[PDB]
Paper text:
Virus ΦcrAss001 (Kehishuvirus primarius) was the first representative of this order to be isolated in pure culture from human faecal samples. Here, we present the characterization of ΦcrAss001 using cryo-electron microscopy (cryo-EM), enabling de novo structure building and elucidation of functions for around 1,440 protein subunits constituting the virion, leading to the identification of a novel ‘crass fold’ in the distal part of the tail. The virion possesses a short non-contractile tail extending approximately 44 nm from an icosahedral capsid. The extended tail barrel formed by widely conserved paralogous ring proteins has a high capacity for storage of cargo proteins alongside the capsid cargo zone, ensuring that the proteins required for the initial stages of crassvirus infection are carried inside virions and delivered to the host cell.
The majority of the portal protein oligomer exhibits 12-fold symmetry and the localized reconstruction imposing [name] symmetry enabled structure determination at 3.09 Å resolution. The majority of the portal protein residues, except for some flexible loop segments (33–35, 68–71, 269–324 and 550–563), could be confidently modelled. At the top of the portal protein, an extended α-helical barrel (C-terminal residues 672–739) extends around 80 Å towards the core of the capsid. This extended feature has an internal van der Waals diameter of around 45 Å at the base of the crown and around 25 Å at its exposed end. The main body of the portal protein beneath the Crown domain is made up of the stem domain, composed of α-helices defining its central tunnel, and the wing domain. Tunnel loops, which are not defined in maps owing to their apparent flexibility, connect the inner stem helix (residues 519–541) with a 34-residue-long kinked helix that is part of the wing. These tunnel loops (residues 550–563) are likely to form a narrow constriction in the portal tunnel, as observed in portal proteins of other viruses. At the surface of the portal wing, there is clear density corresponding to residues 425–552 of the gp45 cargo protein C1. Twelve such segments of gp45 interdigitate with wing loops (SH3-like domains) of the portal, residues 337–380.
Author numbering:
A (entry chain B), B (entry chain B): 1 to 96, 107 to 236
C (entry chain C), D (entry chain C): 1 to 225
The structure:
Amino acid sequence: MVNNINWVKLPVILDRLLRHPLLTDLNLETAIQYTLDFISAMGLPNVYVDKIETIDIKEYRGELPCDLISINQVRLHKNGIALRAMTDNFNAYPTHGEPSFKTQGRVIFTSIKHEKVDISYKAIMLDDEGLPLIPDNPIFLKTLELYIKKEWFTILFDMGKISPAVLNNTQQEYAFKAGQCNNEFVIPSVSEMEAITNMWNQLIPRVTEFRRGFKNLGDKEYIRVH
Amino acid sequence: MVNNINWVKLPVILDRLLRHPLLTDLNLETAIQYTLDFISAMGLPNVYVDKIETIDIKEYRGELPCDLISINQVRLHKNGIALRAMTDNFNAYPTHGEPSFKTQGRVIFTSIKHEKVDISYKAIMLDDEGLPLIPDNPIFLKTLELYIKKEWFTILFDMGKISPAVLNNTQQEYAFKAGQCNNEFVIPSVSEMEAITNMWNQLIPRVTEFRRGFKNLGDKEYIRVH
Amino acid sequence: MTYNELIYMVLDELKLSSDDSYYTPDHVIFLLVKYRSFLLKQRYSDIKKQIPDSDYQSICLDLIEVPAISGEPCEGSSYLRSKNKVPTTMMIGNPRVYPMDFYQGEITYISRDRMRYVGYNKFLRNIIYCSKAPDGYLYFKSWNPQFLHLEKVSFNAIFEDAKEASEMACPEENGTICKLEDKEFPIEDALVPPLIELVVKELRGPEYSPKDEDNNAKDDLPDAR
Amino acid sequence: MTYNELIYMVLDELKLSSDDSYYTPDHVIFLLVKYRSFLLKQRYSDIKKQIPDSDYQSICLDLIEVPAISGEPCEGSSYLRSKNKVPTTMMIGNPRVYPMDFYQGEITYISRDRMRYVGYNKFLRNIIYCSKAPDGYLYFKSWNPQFLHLEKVSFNAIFEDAKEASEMACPEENGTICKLEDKEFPIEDALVPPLIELVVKELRGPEYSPKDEDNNAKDDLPDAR
C-alpha cells in the first residue's frame, strides 16, 4: 500500500451516506454490520492490526487470543522455529517430526505437548467504544459508501421502491470502485517493491523464508567478487 | 508533469459548477468532500507536497507526523542508508540485519531500537484556512468539476430528477477527462525524460538506487575511452 | 396550521355553521385523521420519496423495567417498556427513538419480528432496540445491563393515528397544550388541498341526505322523509 | 404583488364584496398559502428545474446557546438554536442560512438525520450546520467553539407556510411592516393564474351552496334551506 492507514471512526461514513435522501433511514447499527461485511469481502490485510502473543500449549492444545481473526504464523518460543500446518489425521492420538499447528475455534491444536508458542496474528482495530475503526482513505470510504448504498438499494429494489436503472448504476459503480479499492491497498509502495526486488533477484535462490518469520525475505542477496 | 502546479483555493471550483443551474445548491462543504475523494481516486503524486522530518525511534516505534499521507522513503539519520520494508512476522519480539520499517497509523514500526530516522513523505497543501488547495490546471479543474457534477447527478438520477441520457453524458465526459487529467500529470516533462533517459541507457546497470534517496537515479552513465 | 384551522375549513367548505347540525367537528376530526394516513400511504409507499418534516410527530415516553413474562428466574432477561401504549408508526419515513436530543444516541426502532433476534453480533451488543409488541407497548432490548436505566425517550415518526400522537406530545417551552385543536396537525402543506377535498367529498353527499324525521315507530327513510 | 392584491383578486373573482358574507379574507389567506405550497410541489418536485427568486423568503433569527438535554456535564456539547420556531422548508430549492450577508459565510442547512453525524472529517470541522429538530426549532452544530458566538442569522428558503415566514420576515430599510397584507406574497408571477384558479374553484361551489338558515333546533340542510 502506498498511502498510510489513518484511522477514523465509523460515523464518518454516515456523513457521506445521508447526503443521499434515500439513505436517510440508515443507522450506526446498520453501518456497523455493513462495514464488517465489506471489510471481510475485500480481504485487505492492511486494514487489520498485527499482534503477537505468546501462549502456552498444555497437551497439543492452547487457548487462542480473543481478538484473533487470522494467524500470520505460529512459531516456537524457545527456538523461534516456525510451525507449518497439521496434515495428520491422527495427531495427538496414540497407537498401541516437523512441528505443526491447527486452529478451529478459540483453540489451537499443535504437534508439541508442553511448549510455549508465539502467535503472530491479525485483529480488528477498535475505538474507545468497542467498535470498528475504518481507514480515512477516500477510496476505501467511497466504496464502503457505495457498498452500503448497494445493499440498501437491493432491499428497495425487491420492495419495488427503486428503478432497475437506479440499481444497475449502483451495482456498476460499486463494481468499479471495488477494484480500484483493491488495487489501492494491494499494489506495493516503493519501499515494498524494493523488498520484492530483492526476493525476485537471487542468484543463489533462498527457499526457506518460512522458517524465519519471513524476516530475511526482502533482504538483498550479495555476491563476492573473485 | 509538463506544467507547473500553481495553487488556487477551493472556491474557484464553485464559480465553475454554479454556472450550471442544476448545481446551484452546492456548497463549500460539498466541494471539500468531493475534492478529497477526487484527489485520492486519481492518485496523482504531483498534487501532494513533499516533506522531510526527522523522528526518533524509542524502541522499534516512532511517532509519525500529523500531516503524513504517504511515505516516500524512510532512512537512517546517521548513515543515510534507507530502510526497505518489514516482512518479519515476529519483529520486535524476542525468542527465549538489513533494517526495515512498517507504518499503520500514526506509529512507525522499525527494526532498529534506539535511532533517529528521516522520513520523506507527502502531505496535502493547505490554505490560511486549514483547507485543501487545488491546482489551477484547467484540465484538473475541469475534471474535478465533472467529478462533482457526476456525483450530484447520480443522486439526482436515483431521485428521478435527471434523465438517464443526461447522466450517461456526464458519466462519459468525466470518463474522458479523467484519462486526459491522468496523462496531463503523469507524462513527463522534457527535463524528466532526460533523467528517464539516463536511467534507461546504462552499459553497467545501476541496480541499487533505493539505498540512496534515488539521488543518482537519473544521473548520466559515463564510459572512459580506451 | 393547527388542528383548528383544518377542522374549520372543512366545516366552512361544507357550511356546517349551525349547532343543530348532524355532522359535528368530531366527524371531521375522525375523517381528517383517517384521510391523513390514507393520503400519506398513497404518496409515500409505492416508490421512495423524500418525506417532509411536517408529517412527523414527536411523542414523549416514560420507560419502566418490566419482566419478560412474570417474576420467574428462568424466563429470560427483563425489558424496558413504555408505561402507556404507543401509536403505530407508518412504514414510510424515518422513525427515531432518541434520548431527548434528536442529534444524539443510538436507539434503534426495528420490526417486532427482528427484535427477538438482535444483539448476537459481538459488535452490536451495546445498542438498544425498540419495537411495538402486540400488547400495544414499545419494548426495549439490549444485551447491555446499562439500558435498564433509561427513564425517558422521545419517539419521532409518522404515526398512523395523528390524534393519538398529539395526546402523547412532548411538552413545549411554554407548557402543555390542553386542547387538541390548538395543536399542530401533522401533514405537509402541499397535501392539505387533497386532504380537504376528500373529507369534504365524503360528507357533502350525506350532508343533504334525508333523515328519519318522524317519531312514529317506523323507518321513514324509504319515503325520503 | 403583495398579499393584499392576491386576496382581493380572489375575492373579486368570487364577487365576495359584502361584509355580511360567509367566506372572509381569512378563508382566502388560508387557501392561498395552502395552494402555494401545493402548486410549487407540483411543479418543482418531479424533475429538477430552475426555481425563481420569487418563491423564496428570507426570515431573521436570533440564536441562543441551549444545552444538549439539560444542565448535566456528561450529556454532550451544547448547541445554538433559534429562540422562536422556524418554518418548515420545502425540498425544492436552495435553502441558505447566512450571517446577514447572502454572499458570505458557510453555514450549511442539512437534514436532521444527517446532523447527528457531521464534522467527523478533519477538514469539515469549522463548518456550522443547521437543521430543524422535531421541537420546531432550528439547531446549530459544529466542532468549533467559535460557532457559539453567533447572535443572528438569516434564513432564505422556500418555506412550506408562506404566512409563517412573513411574520418572521427581515426588517426593511424603512422598518417593519405591521400588516401581513402589505407584505410580498412569495410565488413566481407565472404561477399566480394557476394559483387564483384553484382557490376560486374551491370556493366557487361552496359560495352558492345553501345554509342552515332557520334557528329551529333542527338541521335544515337536507331541505336545501
